[PDB]
Amino acid sequence: VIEKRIVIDGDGDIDHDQALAQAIREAREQHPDMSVTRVVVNKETELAEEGEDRTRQIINITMTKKLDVW
């Protein structure tokens, strides 16, 4: 299995549908023998008691080996 983690610094909204489309497209292109099996978008907020809560956007793409039909 492959776990592709992509970090975007900043709480700017992410187009979910385009994220999924781009995931599948880049997978087909660069990893033709594998198929995307999960895409999750995380709005990650690290809580700080002493200051400002940092917010990142984490796109996790899980890809496994292609499962032939027979």
Added chain:
Amino acid sequence: TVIEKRIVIDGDGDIDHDQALAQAIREAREQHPDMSVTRVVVNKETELAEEGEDRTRQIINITMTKKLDVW
């Protein structure tokens, strides 16, 4: 020893960050007096679905390590 406490809220109701951190520190002091919370993260996790509505969870991840305190 590192402890990772993961807490899942299936409802997407907004989370009080300050109260989440407070509760983390309180429960840590209570149940693990020899440990100190060193990270608290709130995740608005959205699982992308090609066939319908994207289910959204709220994940509170609390990382606590051994206490760093001389004397």
